[PDB]
C-alpha cells in the first residue's frame, strides 16, 4: 500500500523529531512524539488485515489517514524548522498543543491501532444525532462540507465569523473536522440548541477567552493581574479535552486554575460572578452580560 508507505514515512519523521528534541509539563513534544509514533505503528499493523477498515469511501478510515498523515508531515516540518541543532517558546507551545490534539484524535479513532470512527459516540446526545444524521458513518469531513452541513441547524455568517469558528473547531489545524473534534467543540459550547450563540458569546465576544494556551502560559499571563483579585481567563483544557480550565486570581493574589462541572460555561461564569470570583475578565473592567 501507498498507505503502508505513508505510515512508515510518518513514523520516521517523528523519530527524527524525537531525536532532535533531545536537550516538560503537558503538553510536551518529548512525550507526544514517541507516543504518536507508537500508535502509528499499531495502525500500520492493523491495516494489514482483511476488514476492520469500516464503512468505505469519503470520510472513512483510509480518507482520515490520508489527511491526517499529510497534516502530521506539515506540522512535523514546522517543528523541525524551529529546533536548534520568546517567540520560539510560543511557537513550540502552540505546536505542542497541536501535537497533543493530533495524538488524542488518533487515540480516539484508532485506539490500539483499530479503527472505530464509524462507531464513535459523541458525549452530548443532541450533537451525536446531528453527526450521524448528517455525516452518516464518516469520521471526517473537509471544513467547507462541514460548514454547509452544520448550517442545516446552526448557520454561521461567511467571512471572519465562519473563519473564527473554523479556527475554534479545528484542533489539529488540518482543515478537516473529525467526529472527535466535533465532540470536543459541542462539549465546550453546550447546550446544543444555542450552540453558535454560546460560541459567539464566549469565544468571539468575551474578553476572558484564550485560545491555544497551555497551563503554564495562563499561569504567566495572569500574573499581570495578581494585584486584582477576581481577574480570570478561561481556555480549553489540554489534558481533559472537551473541558474548560478557568484561571483566576484569588483574594490573596495567587493564580489558580480549576476545571468546572459538566455545565454550560455560561452558567459556571454567571454563578462565579454572583459568588464574587470571576469578576474581571483578563483583568479588564467590563464583564460581559451572559443573560
Amino acid at each position: 500500500w501507498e498507505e503502508a508507505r505513508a505510515l512508515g514515512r510518518a513514523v520516521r519523521m517523528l523519530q527524527r523529531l524525537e531525536e532532535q528534541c533531545v536537550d516538560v509539563s503537558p503538553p510536551s513534544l518529548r512525550d507526544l512524539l514517541p507516543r504518536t509514533a507508537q500508535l502509528l505503528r499499531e495502525v500500520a499493523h492493523s491495516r494489514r488485515a482483511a476488514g476492520g477498515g469500516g464503512p468505505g469511501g469519503p470520510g472513512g478510515s483510509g480518507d482520515f489517514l490520508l489527511i491526517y498523515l499529510a497534516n502530521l508531515e506539515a506540522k512535523s516540518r514546522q517543528v523541525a524548522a524551529l529546533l536548534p541543532p520568546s517567540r520560539l517558546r510560543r511557537q513550540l507551545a502552540k505546536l505542542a498543543i497541536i501535537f497533543s490534539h493530533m495524538h488524542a484524535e488518533l487515540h480516539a479513532l484508532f485506539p490500539g491501532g483499530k479503527y472505530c470512527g464509524h462507531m464513535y459516540q459523541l458525549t452530548k446526545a443532541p450533537a451525536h444525532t446531528f453527526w450521524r444524521e448528517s455525516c452518516g458513518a464518516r469520521c471526517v469531513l473537509p471544513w467547507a462540507e462541514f460548514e454547509s452541513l452544520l448550517g442545516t441547524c446552526h448557520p454561521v455568517e461567511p467571512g471572519c465569523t465562519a473563519l473564527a469558528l473554523r479556527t475554534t473547531i479545528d484542533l489539529t489545524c488540518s482543515g478537516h473536522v473529525s467526529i472527535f473534534e466535533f465532540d470536543v467543540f459541542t462539549r465546550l459550547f453546550q447546550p446544543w440548541p444555542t450552540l453558535l450563540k454560546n460560541w459567539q458569546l464566549l469565544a468571539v465576544n468575551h474578553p476572558g477567552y484564550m485560545a491555544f494556551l497551555t497551563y503554564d502560559e495562563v499561569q504567566e499571563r495572569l500574573q499581570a493581574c495578581r494585584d486584582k483579585p477576581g481577574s480570570y481567563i478561561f481556555r480549553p483544557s489540554c489534558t481533559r479535552l472537551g473541558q474548560w480550565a478557568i484561571g483566576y486570581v484569588s483574594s490573596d493574589g495567587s493564580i489558580l486554575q480549576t476545571i468546572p462541572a459538566n455545565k454550560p460555561l455560561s452558567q459556571v461564569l454567571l454563578e462565579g460572578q454572583k459568588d464574587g470570583f470571576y469578576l474581571y475578565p483578563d483583568g479588564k473592567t467590563h464583564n460581559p452580560d451572559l443573560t
Binding site: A245, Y248, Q257, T258, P260, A261, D275, F277
Partner: peptide
C-alpha cells in the same frame, strides 16, 4: 496538583 477545587 495543577487543577484545584471550585472556589465555589
Amino acid at each position: 496538583q495543577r487543577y484545584s477545587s471550585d472556589p465555589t
